Amino acid sequence: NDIARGFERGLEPEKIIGATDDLMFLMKWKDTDEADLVLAKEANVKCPQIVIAFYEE
């Protein structure tokens, strides 16, 4: 889970580009070309609309 502290970077999420197994999302950050793992449990709460756009895919 330590593998997935992307939020601590303090950037704004933009878009989930992937997932893997505790469920994790590869999160892409706004305006940069960078992505890091964050825990789905935590993304649900911090950026629910973005979590949801990932599912409608």
Question: Could you list the residues that contact Na ion (CB under 5 A)?
Answer: 47, 49-50
Task: Tell me the closest approach of the beta carbon of residue 51 to Na ion, in angstroms.
Answer: 7
Residue with Cβ nearer Na ion (39 or 47): 47
Closest CA to 35 of 11, 54, 53, 55: 11
Residue with Cβ nearer Na ion (21 or 56): 56
**Sign, Cα dihedral of 8, 22, 34, 49:** negative
Q: Quick one: DSSP state of residue 2?
A: T
Residue with Cβ nearer Na ion (2 or 49): 49
